[PDB]
Write an enzyme that holds these catalytic residues in place. Structure first.
Site, PDB file in Angstrom:
ATOM      1  N   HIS A   1      -4.155  -3.003   9.360  1.00  0.00           N
ATOM      2  CA  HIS A   1      -3.506  -4.469   9.634  1.00  0.00           C
ATOM      3  C   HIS A   1      -2.609  -5.073  10.592  1.00  0.00           C
ATOM      4  CE1 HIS A   1      -5.305  -6.277   5.761  1.00  0.00           C
ATOM      5  NE2 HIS A   1      -5.437  -5.177   5.376  1.00  0.00           N
TER       6      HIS A   1
ATOM      7  N   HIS B   1      -0.564  -8.087  -2.831  1.00  0.00           N
ATOM      8  CA  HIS B   1      -1.883  -7.412  -1.888  1.00  0.00           C
ATOM      9  C   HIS B   1      -2.767  -7.606  -3.061  1.00  0.00           C
ATOM     10  CE1 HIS B   1      -4.357  -3.261  -0.719  1.00  0.00           C
ATOM     11  NE2 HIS B   1      -4.658  -5.014  -0.466  1.00  0.00           N
TER      12      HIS B   1
ATOM     13  N   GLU C   1      -0.394   1.291  -6.104  1.00  0.00           N
ATOM     14  CA  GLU C   1       1.057   1.017  -5.181  1.00  0.00           C
ATOM     15  C   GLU C   1       1.792   0.296  -5.396  1.00  0.00           C
ATOM     16  OE1 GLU C   1      -1.349  -1.404  -3.142  1.00  0.00           O
ATOM     17  OE2 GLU C   1      -3.644  -0.481  -2.364  1.00  0.00           O
TER      18      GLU C   1
ATOM     19  N   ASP D   1      -4.142 -11.893   5.501  1.00  0.00           N
ATOM     20  CA  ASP D   1      -2.678 -11.911   5.439  1.00  0.00           C
ATOM     21  C   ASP D   1      -1.880 -13.014   5.731  1.00  0.00           C
ATOM     22  OD1 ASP D   1      -3.240  -8.611   6.831  1.00  0.00           O
ATOM     23  OD2 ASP D   1      -1.470  -8.735   5.685  1.00  0.00           O
TER      24      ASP D   1
ATOM     25  N   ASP E   1      -1.310  -9.169   1.760  1.00  0.00           N
ATOM     26  CA  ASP E   1      -2.318  -9.275   1.585  1.00  0.00           C
ATOM     27  C   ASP E   1      -3.190  -9.737   1.035  1.00  0.00           C
ATOM     28  OD1 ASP E   1      -4.848  -8.375   2.461  1.00  0.00           O
ATOM     29  OD2 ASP E   1      -4.387  -6.237   2.168  1.00  0.00           O
TER      30      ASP E   1
ATOM     31  N   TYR F   1      -5.852   4.581  -6.878  1.00  0.00           N
ATOM     32  CA  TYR F   1      -4.833   5.174  -6.955  1.00  0.00           C
ATOM     33  C   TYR F   1      -3.525   3.587  -6.900  1.00  0.00           C
ATOM     34  CZ  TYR F   1      -6.328   9.201  -4.614  1.00  0.00           C
ATOM     35  OH  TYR F   1      -7.111  10.040  -4.501  1.00  0.00           O
TER      36      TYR F   1
ATOM     37  N   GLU G   1       0.612  -1.169   0.192  1.00  0.00           N
ATOM     38  CA  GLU G   1      -0.146  -0.029   0.002  1.00  0.00           C
ATOM     39  C   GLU G   1       0.725   0.805  -0.245  1.00  0.00           C
ATOM     40  OE1 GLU G   1      -3.832   0.208   1.819  1.00  0.00           O
ATOM     41  OE2 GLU G   1      -4.170  -1.407   1.677  1.00  0.00           O
TER      42      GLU G   1
HETATM   43 MG   LIG Z   1      -6.254  -1.489   2.954  1.00  0.00          MG
END
Ligand SMILES: [Mg+2]
Ligand SMILES: *[C@@H]1O[C@H](CO)[C@@H](O[C@@H]2O[C@H](CO)[C@@H](O)[C@H](O)[C@H]2NC(C)=O)[C@H](O)[C@H]1NC(C)=O
Ligand SMILES: *[C@H]1O[C@H](CO)[C@@H](O)[C@H](O)[C@H]1NC(C)=O
Ligand SMILES: [Ca+2]
Ligand SMILES: [Ca+2]
Length: 260
Positions: free
Chosen positions: A252, A134, A78, A212, A168, A76, A39
């Site tokens: 997280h 992720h 990452e 995760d 994640d 967005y 992220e």
């Molecule tokens: Mg998140």
């Protein structure tokens, strides 16, 4: 040797310009010899630069890093960031997984893994790769499943069966329902050993979800894993924080593991 994967919610300039949050982020990451950070919303890499400066505050070269370009089908995007202690491990090289045709709206991952190969003199496995993920929560079953193909690709690229797949995955609660597991090759194949169990809570919020994950494959790597060392790191309990402060650090917990 200690390895962690940490989704730090919308990590970037805002958290890195807050001394209190920086303090804790640094304290968590400094536990580990290698840490994947997810992220990362940092289009000019300035937040990453601040992070390293803080990580290296009282000794240069305490941490080095490798960082991917921004990934994602739209805003967005990452980055996957790996910070590591260069006296402990060396980041040898990396490549972007080919998830098919993006312009087509056809490709298999929102954030296709930027895979990094490590050399580690202090562990039973010397050469291994980490595939970060992720997963898009709305496509979690297909993305986790697709990691099976990413695994096979790593053997094509590097001749390497020793691979840690982590991050994640959004592998629980409503994103992967109890009965959807047989739909996931990374799970059905005995090639892989799931180290973070289905019962884990890896959310800093009051939900109880095993989002995760840490998955391993290959003879040398699987043998190097300390059984039952794979756990979420509850930094709220560990540091005696309020709910507010904990959740301001991230929604997280990191998931960590030890290699012998
Ligand atoms: Mg998140
Ligand atoms: C830096 O982060 C801290 C923690 O999130 C912020 O301090 C909190 O501010 C909120 C809203 O004003 C309060 O409700 C909390 O009581 C504060 N928490 C703590 C632990 O003090 C702070 O706002 C941030 N600093 C800046 C300048 O944005
Ligand atoms: C995606 O789109 C292209 C163009 O329509 C098509 O040729 C291709 O078969 C599709 N790819 C997959 C993997 O389904
Ligand atoms: Ca993609
Ligand atoms: Ca929780």
């Amino acid at each position: 040797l200690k390895i962690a994967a940490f989704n730090i919610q919308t990590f970037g300039e805002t958290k890195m310009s807050n001394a209190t949050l920086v303090s804790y982020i640094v304290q968590i990451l400094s536990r580990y010899d290698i840490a994947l950070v997810q992220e990362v919303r940092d289009s000019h890499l300035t937040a990453v630069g601040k992070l390293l400066d803080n990580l290296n505050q009282d000794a240069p070269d305490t941490y080095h890093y490798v960082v991917s370009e921004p990934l994602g089908r739209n805003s967005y995007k990452e980055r996957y960031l790996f910070v590591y202690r260069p006296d402990q491990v060396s980041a040898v090289d990396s490549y972007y997984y080919d998830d098919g045709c993006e312009p087509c709206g056809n490709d298999t991952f929102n954030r296709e893994p930027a895979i990094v190969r490590f050399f580690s003199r202090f562990t039973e496995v010397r050469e291994f790769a980490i595939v970060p993920l992720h997963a898009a929560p709305g496509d979690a079953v297909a993305e986790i499943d697709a990691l099976y193909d990413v695994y096979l690709d790593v053997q094509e690229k590097w001749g390497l069966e020793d691979v840690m797949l982590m991050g994640d995955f959004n592998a629980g609660c409503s994103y992967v329902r109890p009965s959807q597991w047989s739909s996931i090759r990374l799970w059905t194949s005995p090639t892989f050993q799931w180290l973070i169990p289905d019962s884990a809570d890896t959310t800093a919020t009051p939900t109880h979800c095993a989002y995760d994950r840490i998955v391993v494959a290959g003879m040398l790597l699987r043998g190097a894993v300390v059984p039952d060392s794979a756990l979420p790191f509850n930094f709220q309990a560990a540091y005696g924080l309020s709910d507010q402060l904990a959740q301001a650090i991230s929604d997280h917990y990191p998931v960590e593991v030890m290699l012998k």
